[PDB]
Amino acid sequence: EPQVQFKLVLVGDGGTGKTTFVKRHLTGEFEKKYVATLGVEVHPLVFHTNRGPIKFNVWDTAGQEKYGGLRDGYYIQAQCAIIMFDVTSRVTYKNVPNWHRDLVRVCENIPIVLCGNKVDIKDRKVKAKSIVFHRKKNLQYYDISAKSNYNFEKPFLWLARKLIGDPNLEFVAMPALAPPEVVMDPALAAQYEHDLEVAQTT
Numbered sequence: 001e002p003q004v005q006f007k008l009v010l011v012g013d014g015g016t017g018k019t020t021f022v023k024r025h026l027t028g029e030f031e032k033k034y035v036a037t038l039g040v041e042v043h044p045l046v047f048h049t050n051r052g053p054i055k056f057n058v059w060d061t062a063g064q065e066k067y068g069g070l071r072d073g074y075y076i077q078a079q080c081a082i083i084m085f086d087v088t089s090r091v092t093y094k095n096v097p098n099w100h101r102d103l104v105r106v107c108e109n110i111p112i113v114l115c116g117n118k119v120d121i122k123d124r125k126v127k128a129k130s131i132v133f134h135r136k137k138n139l140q141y142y143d144i145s146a147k148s149n150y151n152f153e154k155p156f157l158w159l160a161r162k163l164i165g166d167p168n169l170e171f172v173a174m175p176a177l178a179p180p181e182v183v184m185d186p187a188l189a190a191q192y193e194h195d196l197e198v199a200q201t202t
């Protein structure tokens with residue numbers, strides 16, 4: 001018996017929280033592989049479903065997105081992807097179309113998730129109404145906080161359901177995660193859940 005394994009590319013501007021987000025899955029960080037000529041660290045994030053074990057091999061940069069773009073070797077062969085931005089920084093959000101363009105050019109029709117990070121910070125700039133454009137382009141969206149573990153499993157459970165072709169797939173136990181470094185206020189989570197429903201119903 002082989003192993004069900006998927007290449008996932010994690011892309012987005014420098015300073016958005018990619019490396020902090022991938023590092024929450026503790027065993028993936030313990031067993032990572034550094035490849036210097038690609039400019040990447042590959043993290044084996046294993047998840048446990050109702051039909052069995054799955055592995056997402058997550059590609060995280062070495063910081064080369066701050067002074068340029070990524071080569072075609074980073075993207076080639078991906079089976080899925082996560083594009084991240086920071087919700088307190090608008091310039092990170094306005095560069096999302098160009099990240100989506102590179103994934104489309106090299107990979108064509110793969111399932112892609114858009115993540116808005118740092119939702120624990122009180123003064124938020126980019127809200128739920130500005131995400132509607134990307135939903136009409138066929139991206140899936142989640143509000144994320146890497147430091148408190150808020151919605152960590154969401155992007156991985158949607159991508160597993162798409163790849164396997166099963167809308168009733170579930171995770172039967174959670175992976176060991178790095179203890180929260182900040183508290184996600186419960187009044188801010190209740191308000192942001194309401195903003196998203198308003199925007200995508202009405």
Ligand SMILES: Nc1nc2c(ncn2[C@@H]2O[C@H](COP(=O)(O)OP(=O)(O)O)[C@@H](O)[C@H]2O)c(=O)[nH]1
Nearest residue numbers: 013014015016017018019020118120145146147
């Ligand atoms: N409060 C808070 N700070 C965050 C969060 N995610 C990232 N940061 C901060 O963002 C900065 C950049 O983080 P890093 O993981 O290196 O991001 P990257 O360059 O995109 O890989 C650091 O100072 C982090 O501590 C988040 O969930 N909450």
Ligand SMILES: [Mg+2]
Nearest residue numbers: 018019061063
């Ligand atoms: Mg990084």
